Amino acid sequence: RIRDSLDSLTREAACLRAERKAKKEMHLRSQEVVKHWTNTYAGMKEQKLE
Amino acid sequence: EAVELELEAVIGFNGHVPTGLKCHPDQEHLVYPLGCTILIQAINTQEQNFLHGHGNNVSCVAISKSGLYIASGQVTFMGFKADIILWDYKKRELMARLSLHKGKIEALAFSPNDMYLVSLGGPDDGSVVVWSIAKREAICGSPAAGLNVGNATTVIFSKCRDEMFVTAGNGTIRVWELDLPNRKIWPTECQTGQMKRIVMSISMANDDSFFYLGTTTGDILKMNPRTKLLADTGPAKDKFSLGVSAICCLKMGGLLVGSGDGLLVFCKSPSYKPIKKIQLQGGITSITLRGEGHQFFVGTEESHIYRVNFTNFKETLITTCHFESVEDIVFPFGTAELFATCAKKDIRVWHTLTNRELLRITVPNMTCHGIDFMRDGKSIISAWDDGRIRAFAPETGRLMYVINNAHRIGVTAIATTSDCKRVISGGGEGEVRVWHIGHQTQKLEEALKEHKSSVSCIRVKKSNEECVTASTDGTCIIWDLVRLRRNQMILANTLFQCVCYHPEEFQIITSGTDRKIAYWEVFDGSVIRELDGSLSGAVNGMDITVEGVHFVTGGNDHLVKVWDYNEGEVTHVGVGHSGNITRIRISPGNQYIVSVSADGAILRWKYPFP
Amino acid sequence: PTKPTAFRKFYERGDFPIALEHDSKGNKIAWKVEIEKLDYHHYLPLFFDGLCEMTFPYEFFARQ
Amino acid sequence: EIPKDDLDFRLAALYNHHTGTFKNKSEILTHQETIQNIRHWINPKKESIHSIQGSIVSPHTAATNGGYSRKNDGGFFST
Amino acid sequence: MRECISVHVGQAGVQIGNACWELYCLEHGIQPDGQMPSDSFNTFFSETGAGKHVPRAVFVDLEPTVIDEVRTGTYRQLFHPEQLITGKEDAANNYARGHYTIGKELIDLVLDRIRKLADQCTGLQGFLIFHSFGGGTGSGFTSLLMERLSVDYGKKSKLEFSIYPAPQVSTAVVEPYNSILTTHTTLEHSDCAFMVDNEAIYDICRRNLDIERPTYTNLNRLIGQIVSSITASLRFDGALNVDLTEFQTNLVPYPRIHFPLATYAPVISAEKAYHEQLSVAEITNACFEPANQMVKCDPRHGKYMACCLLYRGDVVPKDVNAAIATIKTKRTIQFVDWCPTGFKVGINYQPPTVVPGGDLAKVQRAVCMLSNTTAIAEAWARLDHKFDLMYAKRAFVHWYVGEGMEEGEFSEAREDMAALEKDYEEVGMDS
Ligand SMILES: Nc1nc2c(ncn2[C@@H]2O[C@H](COP(=O)(O)OP(=O)(O)OP(=O)(O)O)[C@@H](O)[C@H]2O)c(=O)[nH]1
Ligand SMILES: [Mg+2]
C-alpha cells in the first residue's frame, strides 16, 4: 500500500480521462449512425434541395 | 408494404358468459367467443376466420338448427345501440347487421324452422324483439319484463315454431304466442303457487312437453307450457350448493344439471337424485351436447373446456387460459420453450410449442402487475398490487420470500440485475426502490424519488451500470447503478409504455399513447425521429432481437407490426385479436413472436427476416 | 450434567409466595407472607433442591 | 435375516394366537414373502382487498389533478 | 441488562404498539418470527435458546376485536401467546365498566404477566405505559392497574405516552367525563406523563410532508419514533448518555407539575431533503417554533419551565453548545427564575432507521425534546370548561352510577383539577 501510495494522483486523473474519452466516442459513433439514417428532417431538406 | 406473415397457436378462451360453447350440428368444429370476436376450432386446431366486428365485447351466442347461421350480440355504453350479426358457416361473411336495442343484448335464440330469431335486450330498458331471416328486419316486440315483478334474463323458442318463453330474472315467467297476420306476440304468465325463485338457466324437452328451469336457490323446476301453470317442484334434502347455472337435455328424459360451485349431476324428473356425479374445476356455465349424443362438452367460468364422455362420466380438459386482463409475458434467457403469464390473482407457467400448462400459482384475490425471471433459473420475481413484491420458486410454487411494505401504492414494474444480487422496483407512488438480496435477508438501500406519476417499465443495461424507467409522467430517466443519482432525462409528449435499448447500446426507443415510435440519442435526451403508429390507436409493447435489425411493435388496435430498424419498414400480420395487446417478446432463438392480448389470448407467429 | 429439579416445576405452577425487586443496592426477595410461620416441611427441601440450578432466575431465589 | 428356529417361528409367523383357532402347523408358520397432469400451489391465507394498508389514493387522478387541492399556504399537496 | 416494561392498555395503546414493535425489529436484525440472521437488543427483547427472541410488552383489551388482528396478522410468531390477554365485552366509553365491576376480572392476569416478566429481568428500570385518555378501557383499566402496581413495586419510574384529546376535534361524547376521573389516579401514583394529540400530527403530517389523507398508520409511526429516541441511551453508546432516572429527575420539579410535552425535530419528505442543509443549528431551532408542537398549544403565551433533549446521529457537542447559546439569547422563548440552566443533553452514536413504506427520509442528525411548560394549563382550561357545562344538568351520570360509581367523585375530581390549575400558575408566577 505504501509503495503504491506515491502514484495516487495519476490514477485519479487517468480514470477521469478514460471516462470522458469513452463518453465522447459513444457520442461520435451514434452520430455516425444518425448521419447514415435517411428519414431525418435535415436529410429530407438536403434531398429536397437536391 | 404490410405483408402478412403467418398465424398459429391460438391459446385463450372466453367461458365467462353462459352458453358460449356450441358445437355445430355436423359435430366437427366448435365455435366459442373471445374478447371481441368469435373463434372456430377444428379437430386439427385450424383456427378459422375470426369473424370480425361488434365494435366491443361479444356476450351471447345462438346457432341455427340446420347448421348454417350463427348470431352473436355484444355490449356498449349507456344509450348506444348493440348489433346482432348474422354470419355463415360456409363462407364466413357478415350477412346482416341487426342493430336495434338499448345498451346491450342479454339473450338470443333461433327457431327450429330456420326463419325466426328472437332477442331479449336491456338491463334497464328491457324488451323482446323478433327478427325474420327472409328480410333482415324486426317483426314485432314488447316489454318482456313483468312490471311489479323484476327483470328477465333468457329466452327460448318452442318446436311449434310460434311460441317462445321469457325466463325469470327475479320471478317473472312468461309465455308468448306469435301470430303472423296480426304480426303480434301475446303475453301470458305461468302462475306459481307460493314459489318465487331466481331462475338462472333454462332448457326445453324434445316433444315440447316440458321445459326445465334452474334457479339460484338450487332446485330444478319442471314446467308445462300448455297448462300455463307450475308443473313440478325441486329436490328437498341436498339441493345443489350454489345456483343451478347450466341445464341441458337429452333425447330421452334425463336432464344434465350443473351448479356454479363446480358440480355435475345426472338427474331425472320424478326424483332429482345424483345417479352420476363428477366434481369439476370451477363454476360450470355452459353445457353443449354433440348431436350423436354420446359425448358432450362443458364450459366453465374459469376458462376450462371439458370434453366429458356421457358413458361412465370421465372428463378430459382440452383448453385452459386466464380469466381477466393479462399482462407481462417474459421468456427465460436461453430457452424458447417456456412462458410465464401473470394476471389478476394468478401466475401461470406454460409450454410454448404444445401449449400445455405446466404450473399455476395463486394469490387469493389481489392483483398482479409484473413478472420477471432471474438471470439464472433460481427464482421468479413478481410485483403485485397489494403493496408487495414477491418471489417464487421455479418448480413446486414455493414462496421463497415476500417484501412487506414496499411502496405506498401497488408495485408496478420490476427488474433483474444480471449478477442476481439486485432487484429494481417502481410503483404508482414514484419512489423508485432498490433491493439487495442475500441468502438470509433482503434489504433496501436508497429511494430515488424523481418521478411525479406512475412507472411503466424498468430496463437495465447488458452489463449493469445503467438502467431506464419508462413512466407515464412524460419523463423517462436513465439512472446509474454504481452510484445512486441521475444522469439524463427524456422529457417528451407521450404517456410512455415501452422503452427499449438498442443492442450495442447506441440509442433508446420510446412509445406510448401518442403513437410516435421515437428513437432517442443516449446523451442529452435529444430526439432523432418520429415514426407514426397505425391510425388513431395506441402502442404498448416493443421488442428488439439479439442482433438489432428487427423491431417488433404491438398496441391498442389488433395490429402487431414487424419493423426494420434503421428505416421505417412496416410488415403487418396484426390481423388477430383487437383486445388491447399489452406486451410482446420474441423467443431467444429468434423463431416466434409472442403477444399477450388483454382479454386472455396469447398468440405466437413465426419469425420473419426484417 | 444437571437434572430437572422440582423447584422449577413448583415455580411454573406458582406455589411459592415469593417475589423479586431488583433493588439498586442488591436484589431482594420480597415476601408476601410471614417468614416466621411458614411451612418448613414444604419450603426448605424444595429450596434445597433448587440449589442445584445454574441458570439465572432460580439460583438467586434458592440462595436468598 | 433369521439366525435360528426361534426367530423363524416368530419373526414372521403372521398367526395371532388369540384369533387363529384350530389351525395347522403350516398355517402357523407363514412369512410374508410367501404371500408376495397440471400441478399447482395455493396461498394459505385468503387475503382481502379492502383490508390493505399502503395509502389512500386520491379521488381525482392527481397526476393531472381534477379538483385542485393545493398544499395549505402555497404549493403542491399530493405526492 | 438495563431493561424496561412497556404495557399497552386499551385500543389506542395496542394500535400504537403495533407500530412501535417493528421499528425495534428493524433497528436490530430481528426479523418478524424472532430469528436474527447474522447485546444492544437487550432492553426490549429477551432471547430463547432456539434462536427465538421474545418481546417485553403486555397487550390487554377487554374486547377481543383488535388483538385478533395481531393474533393472525404479520406479527403472530413474534409475541408470546400469553402477552396477548383478551376479553369478551368492552367498556364502551364508561370509566366505571373498566375500573370497577366488570374490569376487576383481567387485572389478576395482567399482574401475573407483569410479575412473570419482571421476575426474569436482571436489571429493572421502569415502566412505559401506552394508554388513551379517550378510552373507556384505556383510561379505566390503567387506573385500576397503577394503583396496585405502585403498591407492589413502588419506587420504580412510570412514563406514560398517552393521547390527549384535541381542543376542537373529538370523536366521542363523554370524553369530558372520562378525562377528569383518571387524573385522580395519575397525580398520586404516577411520575411522568407525556401527552400527544391527533389534530397536530395531521397538521405536521400534511404541512411538512406531502400526504393527502393522513390516518392512524401515520400517527402511530411518528409516536413510535419518539419512544425509540427516548429509549436510545439504554440501548446504544455515545458521548452523553441519559438514563431513565437521569432525565425523569431532571423533569419533575414539583410533585404536581409532572406533565411535559414532546417534540421530534427532523420531519421531512423524501424529495425536499436534498434542498435543506439539515444542520444541528437549524434542527435545534425547529424544536422551538410554535408550528411544531405535537400538542395543540402555543408555548409562547406560556413559559418553558424545564426542558430536556435526546440527540442521536452524527453530532459533535460544539455545534450543540453554539445552538443552545443562541436559544438562550432568543426572546421568543421565556423562562422562570427557578431554573437558570433549563437544559439537558444526551448524545448517541446512531442514525435514525427508515422502516420501509414510511414517508420519512434517512436523515442522520436527529433530535427529540421533552418540555415541562406551564402552557398546557390552557388546554386543561379548554377541557376544564367542558365538564360543569354537562354536570350542571347532571347528564349521562346514570351510566356511571349503574356500573358501580358514586356521584360525588365527579366533584372530587373537579376539585382535584381545581387544585392542579391553582398549582400551575402559583409555581409559574415570578418572585
Ligand atoms: N393515534 C391513535 N389514536 C387512536 C388509535 N385508535 C384509537 N385512537 C384514539 O382513541 C380514542 C378513543 O379511545 P378508544 O381506544 O377508541 O377507546 P378504548 O380504549 O378502546 O375503550 P372502549 O371504547 O371502552 O373499548 C380516540 O379519540 C382516538 O383518537 C390509533 O390507532 N392511533
Ligand atoms: Mg376498545
Distances (CA, A) of B250 to B149, B194, B255, B280: 32, 30, 6, 20
Of B357, B365, B398, the CB nearest to D38: B357
Residue E406 backbone class (left: φ over 0; alpha: ψ -120 to 50; beta: rest)? beta
CA distance E317 to E308: 15
Distances (CA, A) of B78 to B103, B412, E67: 5, 32, 47
Residues contacting E314, CB < 8 A, separation 6+: E351, E364, E365
CB B591 within 8 A of CB B606: yes
CA distance B305 to B300: 7
- DSSP string computed for B485-531: SEEEEEE-SS-EEEEEEPTTSSEEEEEESS-EEEEEETTTT-EEEEE
B484, B447, B489: which is closest to B469 by C-alpha?
B489
CA distance B101 to B120: 9
For E219, the enclosing helix (H) or strand (E) is: helix E216-230
CA distance B93 to B85: 10
Q: Within 10 A of E202 (CB to CB), how many other CB atoms are there?
A: 18
**In terms of CA atoms, which chain E residue is nearest residue B485?**
E274
E73, B566, B251, E63: which is closest to A43 by C-alpha?
B566
Greatest extent of chain A over all pairs of C-alpha atoms, in Å: 67
Where b means 16+ CB within 10 Å and e means fewer, B174-191 reads: bbbebeeeeeebeeeebe
Q: Where are the beta strands (DSSP E) in B75-232?
A: 84-86, 96-98, 105-110, 116-121, 127-132, 137-142, 152-157, 163-168, 174-179, 184-189, 199-204, 211-215, 220-224, 229-232
Alpha-carbon torsion E188, E190, E192, E197, what sign?
Answer: negative
Three-state secondary structure call for residue E216: helix
E232, E244, E129, E225: which is closest to E185 by C-alpha?
E129
H helix count then E strand count, chain E: 14, 12
CA distance B288 to B62: 12
Three-state secondary structure call for residue B169: coil
Shortest-distance Cα residue to atom 26 of ligand 1: E134
CA distance E296 to E198: 9
- To which residue does cell 370497577 refer? E100
If DSSP states are collapsed to H, E and C, what string results for C3-60? Answer: CCCHHHHHHHHCCCCEEEEEECCEEEEEECCCCCCCCHHHHHHHHHHHCCCCCHHHHH
Residues in chain A: 50
CA distance E64 to B465: 53
**Residue of E132, E199, E203 to test ligand 1 pocket, by largest number of atoms within 8 Å of CB:** E132
Query: Which triple of cell numbers denotes residue B5?
Result: 406473415
Q: Is E49 annotated as a binding residue?
A: no
CB B40 within 8 A of CB B31: yes
Alpha-carbon torsion B357, B362, B368, B370, what sign?
Answer: negative
E130, β-bridge pairs: E8
- To which residue does cell 325463485 refer? B197
CB E328 within 8 A of CB E285: no
Give break positions in chain B: residue before each, C–N beyond 2.5 Å. Answer: none
Q: Where are the beta strands (DSSP E) in B111-150?
A: 116-121, 127-132, 137-142
Tell me if E357 and B447 make a contact (CB, 8 A cut-off): no
Three-state secondary structure call for residue D56: coil
Q: Is D43 on the interface with B (CB under 8 A)?
A: yes
Residues contacting B7, CB < 8 A, separation 6+: B47, B573, B575, B576, B603, B605
CB E214 within 8 A of CB E205: yes
Instruction: Give the strand order in the sheet containing B466-470.
Output: B457-460, B466-470, B475-480, B486-491
Residues contacting B449, CB < 8 A, separation 6+: B430, B431, B432, E270, E271
CB B60 within 8 A of CB B21: no
Instruction: Give partners of A (≥3 CB pairs < 8 A).
Output: B
- To which residue does cell 343451478 refer? B244
CA distance B440 to E299: 49
Instruction: Give the strand order in the sheet containing B22-23.
Output: B22-23, B30-33, B38-41
How many CA atoms are closer than 13 Å to the CA of B576, on its beta-carbon side?
32
E15, β-bridge pairs: none
What is the pairing mode between strands E194-196 and E157-163? Answer: parallel
CA distance B151 to B169: 5
The one-letter amino acid code at B149 reads V
B186, B56, B165, B26: which is closest to B107 by C-alpha?
B165
CB B336 within 8 A of CB B587: yes
CA distance B251 to B271: 19
Alpha-carbon torsion B386, B390, B394, B396, what sign?
Answer: negative
Residue E416 main-chain phi, psi, to 5 deg = -65, -50
CA distance B105 to B61: 11
Query: Which triple of cell numbers denotes residue B367?
Result: 392483483
CA distance E4 to chain C (A): 13
E259, E252, E244: which is closest to E133 by C-alpha?
E259
- DSSP string computed for E304-322: EEE---EE-SS--HHHHHH
CA distance B489 to B522: 10
Residues contacting E148, CB < 8 A, separation 6+: E107, E111
Residues with CB under 5 A from ligand 2 (ion): E 11, 90
The one-letter amino acid code at E305 reads M
Greatest extent of chain C over all pairs of C-alpha atoms, in Å: 36
Q: Is E245 annotated as a binding residue?
A: no
Alpha-carbon torsion E151, E154, E159, E164, what sign?
Answer: positive
Q: Within 10 A of B339 (CB to CB), how many other CB atoms are there?
A: 24
B163, B160, B175, B168: which is closest to B195 by C-alpha?
B168
Distances (CA, A) of B174 to B54, B197, B201, E267: 30, 14, 15, 69
Q: Within 10 A of B599 (CB to CB), how many other CB atoms are there?
A: 23
CA distance A43 to A47: 6
CB B185 within 8 A of CB B130: yes
CA distance B429 to B226: 65
Residues contacting B483, CB < 8 A, separation 6+: none
The one-letter amino acid code at B592 reads Y
CA distance B297 to D8: 61
How many CA atoms are closer than 13 Å to the CA of E263, on its beta-carbon side?
24
Q: Is E132 annotated as a binding residue?
A: yes
B552, β-bridge pairs: B543, B562
Tell me if D76 and E210 make a contact (CB, 8 A cut-off): yes
Query: Which triple of cell numbers denotes residue E148?
Result: 396496585
What is the pairing mode between strands B295-300 and B284-289? Answer: antiparallel
CB E288 within 8 A of CB E329: no
CA distance E5 to E158: 10
Residues contacting E410, CB < 8 A, separation 6+: E177, E180, E181, E391, E397
CA distance C26 to E122: 11
- What does R_g of chain C's alpha carbons equal in angstroms? 12
What is the pairing mode between strands B105-110 and B116-121? Answer: antiparallel
Q: Where are the beta strands (DSSP E) in B22-94?
A: 22-23, 30-33, 38-41, 58-63, 70-74, 84-86
- DSSP string computed for E133-163: TT-SSTTTHHHHHHHHHHHHT-SSEEEEEEE
E153, E1, E243, E58: which is closest to C21 by C-alpha?
E153
Alpha-carbon torsion B50, B51, B57, B62, what sign?
Answer: negative
Which atom of ligand 1 approaches the CA of E15 most closely? 31
CB B247 within 8 A of CB B287: yes
The one-letter amino acid code at E282 reads E
Where b means 16+ CB within 10 Å and e means fewer, C3-18 reads: eebebeebbeeeebeb
Q: Within 10 A of E48 (CB to CB), how many other CB atoms are there?
A: 11
Three-state secondary structure call for residue B571: strand
Residue B439 main-chain phi, psi, to 5 deg = -65, -35
The one-letter amino acid code at B287 reads I
Three-state secondary structure call for residue E182: helix
B168, β-bridge pairs: B152
E246 is catalytic: yes
CA distance C40 to chain E (A): 24
Shortest-distance Cα residue to atom 5 of ligand 1: E12
CA distance B441 to E243: 33
Residues contacting E330, CB < 8 A, separation 6+: E288
CA distance E178 to E387: 10
Which of E147, E199, E246, E282 is catalytic? The answer is: E246
B453, B466, B452, B565: which is closest to B517 by C-alpha?
B565
B238, B237, B247, B235: which is closest to B271 by C-alpha?
B235
B526, B415, B410, B551: which is closest to B470 by C-alpha?
B415
B214, B333, B226: which is closest to B265 by C-alpha?
B214
CB B405 within 8 A of CB D52: no
Residues contacting E20, CB < 8 A, separation 6+: E6, E130, E220, E223, E224, E227, E228
CA distance B297 to B237: 29
- To which residue does cell 421468479 refer? B380
CB B117 within 8 A of CB B73: no
Query: Which triple of cell numbers denotes residue B568?
Result: 421505417
Alpha helices in B245-299 (DSSP H): none
**Residue of E8, E11, E63, E196 to test ligand 1 pocket, by largest number of atoms within 8 Å of CB:** E11
CA distance E340 to E344: 12
What residues of chain A have any CB closer than 8 angstroms to a CB in chain B? 23, 26-27, 29-30, 33-34, 36-41
E83, E53, E366, E57: which is closest to E230 by C-alpha?
E366
What is the pairing mode between strands E310-311 and E261-264? Answer: unpaired
CA distance B465 to E107: 61
CB B242 within 8 A of CB B250: no
Cα dihedral E382→E388→E391→E393 (10° resolution): -110
Burial, E31: exposed, middle or buried (Cβ in 10 Å; 0-12, 13-18, 19+)? Answer: middle
Q: Within 10 A of E188 (CB to CB), how many other CB atoms are there?
A: 13
CA distance E148 to E144: 7
CA distance C23 to chain E (A): 9
Alpha-carbon torsion B136, B142, B146, B148, what sign?
Answer: positive
- Angle at Cα E200 formed by Cα E6 and Cα E185, nearest 5°? 45
CB B230 within 8 A of CB B223: yes
For E328, the enclosing helix (H) or strand (E) is: helix E317-329
Residues contacting B459, CB < 8 A, separation 6+: B415, B467, B468, B470, B499, B500, B501
Which ligand number lies closest to the CA of residue E137? 1
Greatest extent of chain D over all pairs of C-alpha atoms, in Å: 105
B242, B342, B258, B348: which is closest to B300 by C-alpha?
B258
B71, B77, B67, B83: which is closest to B38 by C-alpha?
B71
Q: Within 10 A of B65 (CB to CB), how many other CB atoms are there?
A: 14
CB B201 within 8 A of CB B245: yes
Residue C61 main-chain phi, psi, to 5 deg = -60, -40
Resolution of this entry, Å: 3.4
The one-letter amino acid code at B93 reads E
Residue B341 backbone class (left: φ over 0; alpha: ψ -120 to 50; beta: rest)? beta
E55, E48, E118: which is closest to E81 by C-alpha?
E55
Residue E165: DSSP 8-state: P
